[PDB]
């Protein structure tokens, strides 16, 4: 399981730009905020945060997302006014993903001696 | 390890709608296509490619990011031109993510067994 989720919360940084490429976004994305909202409260996501240690970051990122970025995201009428909430988001999935890997890959080379 | 490769393959789907979201490019935009290059061509992404199976299919995207996309990303004054070879491009980028992702389970797994 380990695998598939640093793939899924790694997916959300490209999910992040798609949307950013569609701006201003119409009726026709509502589809990809849905995929994006259901990768991101995700079970499998929590579940990684929690075995990585990473809880408290995970629900930062998905407060901001559900409270100002998807807003922001909706209200924009051209890219510039949120690229830079975009790029800082991703860097923020960035640390996440960064941190489902140090505890990931350790978890996998000590299987043994555990 | 295999664990990061995921990562920084996953990774080349954000960047190609990173460039894409930048569409017109300008010369601010060189750093993005430098570091796209570093990812693509790094010695890390062509081990764990070799390891899990996945080497033609990251070379067949290797030379497509190089003889269509950035000449298709850098010609176009409007996403519309050049928004659907992305997407394109980043399903192609979900099945090499997805076999580093399958090989490396299936690696556990076999321990587990």
Redesign the interface.
């Known amino acids: 399981?380990?695998?598939?989720a640093?793939?899924k919360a790694?997916?959300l940084?490209?999910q992040?730009?798609?949307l950013?490429?569609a701006?201003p976004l119409s009726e026709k994305d509502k589809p990809l905020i849905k995929e994006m909202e259901q990768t991101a409260f995700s079970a499998e996501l929590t579940r990684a945060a929690e075995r990585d240690g990473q809880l408290a970051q995970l629900q930062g990122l998905q407060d901001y997302w559900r409270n100002e970025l998807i807003p922001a995201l909706m209200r924009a009428q051209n890219?510039e006014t949120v690229?830079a909430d975009?790029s800082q988001f991703?860097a923020g999935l960035?640390q996440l993903?960064?941190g489902?890997?140090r505890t990931?890959?350790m978890r996998?080379?000590t299987?043994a001696a555990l």
């Open positions: 399981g380990s695998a598939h640093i793939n790694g997916s940084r490209m992040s730009y798609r950013l490429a701006v890219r690229s975009v991703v960035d993903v960064s489902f890997d990931t890959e996998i080379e299987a």
